Amino acid sequence: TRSSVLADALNAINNAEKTGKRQVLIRPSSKVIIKFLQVMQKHGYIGEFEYIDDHRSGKIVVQLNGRLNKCGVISPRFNVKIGDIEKWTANLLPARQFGYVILTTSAGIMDHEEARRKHVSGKILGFVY
């Protein structure tokens, strides 16, 4: 059964970049997914990506340039304080400034650098590096 649509999406992205497809399809779509993709695009990891609506959950088609080393979802979505963020960046990333860790805070879903800049915190969604 389906537990995390986001988990399925990231797994599909990882497999597509695995085998070298330039484009990959994701379904179902969601706001958590789509905001995660906007963050990835701002950090530049992913190229053009494109939302299907079908009057249902919807789909996405995502353009790949092959620079995604790894993207994953940490489950369940642990609560994270401002102090703890560094610990997380230590565990999930190859090096301290290498990759990003994605947090949902009261201000929305953003990377940990932006969360630190805004002095916000919340629970964790996953990692990209």
Residues in contact with RNA by the rule CB under 7 A: 1-4, 7-8, 11-12, 14-20, 27-28, 54-57, 59, 68-70, 72-76, 91
DSSP at 53: -
DSSP three-state, residue 96: coil
Residue among 2 and 31 whose Cβ is closer to RNA = 2
As a whole number of angstroms, the distance between CA 70 and CA 40 comes to 11
Of the two residues 20 and 44, which places its CB atom closer to RNA in the complex?
20
- Gap between the Cα atoms of 28 and 17, Å rounded: 19
Instruction: Tell me how far, at minimum, the Cβ of 3 lies from RNA, in Å.
Output: 3
Q: Are 79 and 122 in contact (CB under 8 A)?
A: yes
Of 99 and 122, the one with the shorter C-beta distance to RNA is 99
Q: Which is nearer to RNA, 53 or 106 (CB)?
A: 53
Tell me how far, at minimum, the Cβ of 58 lies from RNA, in Å.
Answer: 9
> Least CB distance from residue 119 to RNA, whole Å?
25
Closest approach, Cβ 20 to RNA, in A, equals: 5
Cβ contacts of 116 within 8 Å, gap of 6 or more: 82, 85
Question: What is the Cα–Cα distance from 87 to 84, expressed in whole angstroms?
Answer: 5
